[PDB]
Design a protein around this ligand. Sequence first.
Ligand SMILES: O=C(O)[C@H]1O[C@@H](O[C@H]2[C@H](O)[C@H](O)[C@H](O[C@H]3[C@H](O)[C@H](O)[C@H](O)O[C@@H]3C(=O)O)O[C@@H]2C(=O)O)[C@@H](O)[C@@H](O)[C@@H]1O
Length: 308
Amino acid sequence: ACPAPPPGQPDIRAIGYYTDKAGSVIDPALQQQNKDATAPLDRYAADVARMSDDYLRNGDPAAAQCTLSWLGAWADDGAMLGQMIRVNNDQSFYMRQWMLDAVAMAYLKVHDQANPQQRARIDPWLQKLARANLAYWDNPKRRRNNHYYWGGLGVLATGLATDDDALWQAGHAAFQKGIDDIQDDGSLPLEMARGQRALHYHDYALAPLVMMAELARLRGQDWYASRNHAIDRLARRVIEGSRDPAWFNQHTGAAQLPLQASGWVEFYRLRSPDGGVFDAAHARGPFHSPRLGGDLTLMATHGIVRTP
Ligand SMILES: O=C(O)[C@H]1O[C@@H](O[C@H]2[C@H](O)[C@H](O)[C@H](O[C@H]3[C@H](O)[C@H](O)[C@H](O)O[C@@H]3C(=O)O)O[C@@H]2C(=O)O)[C@@H](O)[C@@H](O)[C@@H]1O
């Protein structure tokens, strides 16, 4: 009753799809190539997201055992521990970050049903993907925009699930840089340079900062307070933007593409409702995002974990 996982490929070969300097103008052809080259990775991500969602939703341990079996299978296969093949950019590396986020979060959701044999296979594999993602960012030439925040989520989840203190601190460092980047107007200077997609990249930067704050909460820490509730500016800026892009239209001189806020709202409204400004976005739910851990509605309402 646990279906067969797809084989785990050690190598990734994703493809960058932006043509302009502002990373805002898509080549439909290049977008399709990336979509097709990453479909297997995205299927696995959605699947372990979904089965771990199933486990949170009814507590059936079969769904948790099937999640753990899939994670174990890709760990034994050494999935994603091979070559990040550069094609026109660092997209293969970005996928290893995004995939660690999905698998680490899935693991964490079903971690209370893992047996010693399962921890021993999965933990080393998460730790290895975590330390590889981290070493990319030791190079000061690498621009620490939203990619560093998405990297941080997976490293933070791995540190929590595998009880590795170094990864926990290193994940905290990726969260802290994102918060430190929030200006008084709630903008992120590197995301302000994405022209047409500036509002999208503000929302996109925020989602993993929220989820990292939520992982801290599991451990009994409150990171939401950092730098006098700086996150609230980015949150209000983003939710303002989804309603009316005018501020973004002026500040970038580009007409923002259409945007609805992503599933961070599910968590954020509970921690800082700000007189209901995030309720309209909530009403559009439920939100499914495998790279943020899957059903953000379910996890916001009922917890990322069923037991501490
Ligand atoms: O078509 C979709 O909307 C597609 O979104 C996918 O996630 C995107 C993500 O929203 C974001 O735009 C990200 O941006 C990267 C980009 O790929 C490239 O590396 C750029 O130069 O850096 C960007 C950055 O983060 O700043 O790209 C994600 C991606 O997967 O390519 C998925 O959620 C997908 O499932 C969905 O259909």
